């Protein structure tokens, strides 16, 4: 069992790093950048109607 545990721990240590370092900042950058562009289209329209 002991040899079997050693083989599994390595797959498991890899995953804990993988999520934090890659996934979480990829989600952050995508969401915020699209949020910012999306609000811009809406704001300029108001200014053009007003003008």
């Amino acid at each position: 069992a002991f040899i079997i545990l050693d083989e599994v721990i390595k797959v498991t240590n890899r995953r804990v790093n993988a999520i934090e370092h890659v996934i979480i900042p990829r989600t952050e950058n995508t969401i915020a950048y699209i949020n910012s562009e999306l609000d811009e289209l809406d704001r300029e329209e108001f200014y053009r109607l007003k003008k």
Partner: protein, 593 residues
């Protein structure tokens, strides 16, 4: 009188108009087109013109009719397909050779040439009458007289003359009321303005259901008549199918089908389907179509008409509610109606503040919806009527957090979900438990307990299975599981069944979407029972693989029981399901030991 100052789109400006009301019907042009002065800024009137423009010139006379835009309510509304202000389509089809009314041509809302059979009421010479009272009837519909000839709301006086039975026309006089001298002559049809709601004596509690016939609808929360209901769509998730299927199962005495700004092939489809398709109880003669009044607008018609469509429909639903008939208002889709308000907002030259949709949108979406409900019929004779609005809603901002969807969820009480991704795998309606809620649940479930179903118990448990199953599924994806507790597998497994039997239904296979409310109770009963045995078996010891395999033969049968509908008797609780229950317990014993 007035003069056309400018023609800008389908929208017309006219100068020299004063002392006019803001819903006045106006005749624009030298062709005498229908139009409606929504607003006036000084002398200039903006008019929504409900016919095309391709040759309207300035300097042409504009004549006010001296009254609002109204609709005519009375005999011969059934079995006719109308546009959004009501013109009889059939008469046009032979005569003009057109379906979209061309300029130079106009016809009035009801027929003039058709005589009707008039039967006297309960009232006689000298009797006082007021709004929503029954002055007579005309025999229309398959199964009952549906047309009660009612005195229009807010009008009163004494009837000096009630005419005798015979056949009469609807431009012909048959009643006179005296109240301030002779009040007026009345005909069969009576007038009411569409932008103005009808009054009711009072609002009443919803407790009566409508049989939608849709197994997934009947299962997860109550089906309500008097209802307020939304179903999300997106155009390509089986939504049209479940609407026409819904029109056929509806068990209401009258159905008013409303095309907001639809496909146009579908406005053909519902027309062809109605006279040759049989209703659930089955009518006598032209089942669905006799019971149906149709307002049909395609996108291609004038946006002035598409704006009006929904109003015409609710005033018809409301008249019928006051007749003491139970009515289904089926509307598809409100977002197209909202898109129509938006088309007008840019053309008039308004200021939108809701992503290019008008600021006015929120007050109009709400005002319209509040007209549905169960209520006590307008008038003295006392009857009960209802209008249940089943409304489709859809994106329009492209988001799901766009104004259209924000306003609609707030005003509605019932939401049953639909997901596009699952719908593609073919399991529509593919209800999202999380977005779904019902307020009606408590009163409706109390009613159903009296009616015989033990429903409420199952309902919580149906929801409970689907909820835990959802959560478990993210945990299988996220960690990338190497094991599961033996109970959790059962939860997931029992949810899969729910998917097939309820959620997977096809509205053109009537073996695969039809169950009465009791049949629905029995099928769900079987599932909830399976979960109950299965949870106990693991507890007493037995492996999951043992549980699944030994249960085996009854597990196949329940899966495959979605291919049934009443056809073994006129009975709503079957031997089919009752036999399964005892066999299921027998199976449980095996699993356990």
């Amino acid at each position: 009188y007035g003069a056309i100052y400018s023609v800008s789109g389908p929208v017309v400006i006219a100068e020299n108009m004063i002392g006019c009301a803001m819903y006045e019907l106006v005749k624009v042009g030298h062709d005498n087109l229908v139009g409606e002065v929504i607003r006036i800024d000084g002398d200039k009137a903006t008019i929504q013109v409900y016919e095309e423009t391709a040759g309207l010139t300035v300097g042409d006379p504009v004549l006010r009719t001296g009254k609002p835009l109204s609709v005519e309510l009375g005999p011969g509304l059934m079995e006719t397909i109308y546009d959004g202000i009501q013109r009889p389509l059939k008469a046009i089809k032979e005569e003009s050779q057109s379906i979209y009314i061309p300029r130079g041509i106009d016809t009035p809302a009801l027929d003039r040439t058709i005589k009707w059979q008039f039967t006297p009421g309960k009232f006689q010479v000298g009797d006082h009458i007021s709004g929503g009272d029954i002055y007579g009837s005309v025999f229309e519909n398959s199964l009952i007289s549906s047309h009660k000839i009612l005195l229009p709301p807010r009008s009163r006086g004494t009837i000096t003359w009630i005419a005798p039975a015979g056949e009469y026309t609807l431009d012909e006089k048959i009643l006179e009321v005296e109240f301030d001298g002779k009040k007026s002559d009345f005909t069969l049809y009576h007038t009411w303005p569409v932008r103005v709601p009808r009054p009711v004596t009072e609002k009443l509690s919803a407790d009566y259901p409508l049989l939608t016939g849709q197994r997934v609808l009947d299962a997860l929360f109550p089906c309500v008549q008097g209802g307020t209901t939304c179903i999300p769509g997106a155009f390509g998730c089986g939504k049209t199918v479940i609407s026409q299927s819904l029109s056929k199962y509806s068990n209401s005495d009258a159905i008013i089908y409303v095309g907001c700004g639809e496909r146009g092939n579908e406005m053909a489809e519902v027309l062809m389907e109605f006279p040759e398709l049989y209703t659930e109880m089955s009518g006598t003669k032209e089942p669905i179509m006799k019971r149906t009044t149709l307002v049909a607008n395609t996108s291609n018609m004038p946006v002035a008409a598409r704006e009006a469509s929904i109003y015409t429909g609710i005033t018809l639903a409301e008249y019928f509610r006051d007749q003491g008939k139970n009515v289904s208002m089926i509307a598809d889709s409100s977002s197209r109606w909202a898109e129509a308000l938006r088309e007008i907002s840019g053309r008039l030259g308004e200021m939108p503040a809701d992503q290019g949709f008008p600021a006015y949108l929120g007050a109009k979406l709400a005002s319209f919806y509040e007209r549905a409900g169960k209520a006590v019929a307008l008038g003295s004779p006392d009857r009960t009527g209802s209008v249940s609005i089943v409304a489709a809603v859809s994106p329009a901002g492209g988001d799901f957090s766009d104004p259209v969807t924000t306003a609609t969820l707030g005003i509605t009480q019932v939401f049953w979900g639909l997901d596009k991704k699952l719908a593609q795998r073919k399991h529509f309606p593919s209800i999202n438990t999380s977005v779904s809620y019902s307020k009606y649940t408590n009163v409706l479930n109390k009613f159903y307990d009296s009616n015989y179903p033990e429903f409420p118990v199952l309902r919580d448990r149906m929801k409970e299975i689907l909820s835990n199953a959802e959560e478990l599924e993210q945990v299988v994806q996220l960690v990338g599981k190497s094991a599961l507790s033996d109970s959790d597998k059962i939860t997931l497994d029992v949810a899969t069944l729910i998917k097939e039997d309820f959620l997977q239904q096809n509205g053109y296979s009537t073996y695969d979407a039809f169950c009465p409310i009791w049949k629905t109770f029995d099928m769900m009963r079987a599932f909830i029972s399976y979960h109950d045995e299965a949870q106990k078996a693991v507890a007493n010891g037995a492996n999951w693989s043992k549980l699944a395999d030994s249960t085996g033969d009854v597990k196949h049968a329940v899966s495959s029981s979605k291919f049934f509908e009443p056809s073994r008797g006129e009975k709503e609780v079957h031997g089919e399901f009752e036999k399964l229950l005892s066999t299921m317990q027998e199976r449980f014993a095996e699993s356990t030991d």
